[PDB]
Design a protein around this motif. Sequence first.
Motif, PDB file in Angstrom:
ATOM      1  N   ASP A   1       0.584  -1.103  -0.010  1.00 27.51           N
ATOM      2  CA  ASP A   1      -0.046  -0.128  -0.005  1.00 27.51           C
ATOM      3  C   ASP A   1       0.833   1.384   0.072  1.00 27.51           C
ATOM      4  O   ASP A   1       0.368   2.145   0.229  1.00 27.51           O
ATOM      5  CB  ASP A   1      -0.966  -0.068   1.157  1.00 27.51           C
ATOM      6  N   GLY A   2       2.198   1.110  -0.445  1.00 30.18           N
ATOM      7  CA  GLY A   2       3.126   2.321  -0.289  1.00 30.18           C
ATOM      8  C   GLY A   2       3.459   2.914   0.957  1.00 30.18           C
ATOM      9  O   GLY A   2       4.150   3.795   1.138  1.00 30.18           O
ATOM     10  N   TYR A   3       3.389   1.948   2.277  1.00 29.38           N
ATOM     11  CA  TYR A   3       3.939   2.211   3.348  1.00 29.38           C
ATOM     12  C   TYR A   3       5.403   1.915   3.452  1.00 29.38           C
ATOM     13  O   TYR A   3       5.933   1.135   2.851  1.00 29.38           O
ATOM     14  CB  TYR A   3       3.289   1.536   4.400  1.00 29.38           C
ATOM     15  N   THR A   4       6.249   2.787   4.071  1.00 29.89           N
ATOM     16  CA  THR A   4       7.545   2.783   4.389  1.00 29.89           C
ATOM     17  C   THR A   4       7.934   2.321   5.948  1.00 29.89           C
ATOM     18  O   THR A   4       7.202   2.557   6.626  1.00 29.89           O
ATOM     19  CB  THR A   4       8.252   4.102   3.850  1.00 29.89           C
ATOM     20  N   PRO A   5       9.204   2.094   6.125  1.00 32.20           N
ATOM     21  CA  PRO A   5       9.732   1.790   7.500  1.00 32.20           C
ATOM     22  C   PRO A   5       9.300   3.437   8.271  1.00 32.20           C
ATOM     23  O   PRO A   5       8.840   3.068   9.453  1.00 32.20           O
ATOM     24  CB  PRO A   5      11.250   1.683   7.416  1.00 32.20           C
ATOM     25  N   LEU A   6       9.791   4.301   7.624  1.00 23.87           N
ATOM     26  CA  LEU A   6       9.326   5.706   8.322  1.00 23.87           C
ATOM     27  C   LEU A   6       8.091   5.694   8.739  1.00 23.87           C
ATOM     28  O   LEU A   6       7.695   6.126   9.870  1.00 23.87           O
ATOM     29  CB  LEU A   6       9.964   6.773   7.425  1.00 23.87           C
TER      30      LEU A   6
END
Length: 91
Positions: free
Chosen positions: A34-39
């Motif tokens: 879903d386009g989520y990053t570790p940040l």
Amino acid sequence: DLGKKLLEAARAGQDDEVRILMANGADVNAKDKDGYTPLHLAAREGHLEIVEVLLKAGADVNAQDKFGKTAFDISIDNGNEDLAEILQKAA
């Protein structure tokens, strides 16, 4: 894919694993389905220490998920002002 592992360690707020993964070359700007990053994930879960570590390693504050949202947007929506300011300063 060290990227997916870093998304997992970050969300869980595991400082040790996060740093080991980054040292082995994990892409700090990796994105999941879903386009989520570790940040984004560390930020939402309110892991401030992890966020700083990621920021210092060049994590993109402006990275959007599939809904156009960033780490900063969810910090604000959650009312976590400490985090929002940290993110604002690194942008």
